[PDB]
Ligand SMILES: CCCCCCCCCCCCO[C@@H]1O[C@H](CO)[C@@H](O[C@H]2O[C@H](CO)[C@@H](O)[C@H](O)[C@H]2O)[C@H](O)[C@H]1O
């Protein structure tokens with residue numbers, strides 16, 4: 401009950417699905433840059449912080 | 454003294470560690486990130502001076518009356 405001409409339609413459907421998946425999964429989260437997350441990297445320096453203005 | 458496995462933390466394969474969550478859009482909340490919410494007392498210092506004086510004086514008054 402499934403002719404062989406109907407296969408590439410199914411393949412196209414699944415290609416659309418997996419492409420919709422990979423366009424999201426291709427994205428990734430980079431390194432965090434919030435200073436509040438890294439303030440203790442500077443708090444723990446071997447010298448006190450110079451607020452120079 | 455100790456094998457390399459103990460030092461590097463793995464016998465054969467180094468397992469991936471799940472990174473720390475950040476909670477974007479707000480300050481980190483840790484045991485060391487609490488000074489953002491709780492600074493040293495700075496609002497009622499002069500009231501502290503006054504209340505210390507009055508506490509000393511009232512205590513001395515009632516203590517002397519009790520003793521006498
Ligand atoms: C020197 C004289 C002869 C005696 C020699 C033996 C002395 C032993 C006492 C020192 C022990 C130090 O113990 C030390 O513990 C830490 C735990 O933080 C282990 O740390 C290990 O495990 C942690 C997690 O638990 C891993 O993430 C890390 O990568 C790995 O190093 C060290 O591998 C070990 O060296």
Ligand SMILES: COCCOCCOCCOc1ccc(C(C)(C)CC(C)(C)C)cc1
Nearest residue numbers: 478479480481482486487488489490491492
């Ligand atoms: C005995 O010790 C008590 C321990 O419990 C501490 C209770 O903490 C609850 C604090 O509640 C808040 C919630 C929000 C805030 C805000 C976000 C409003 C503070 C702000 C604006 C300064 C960041 C402050 C306090």
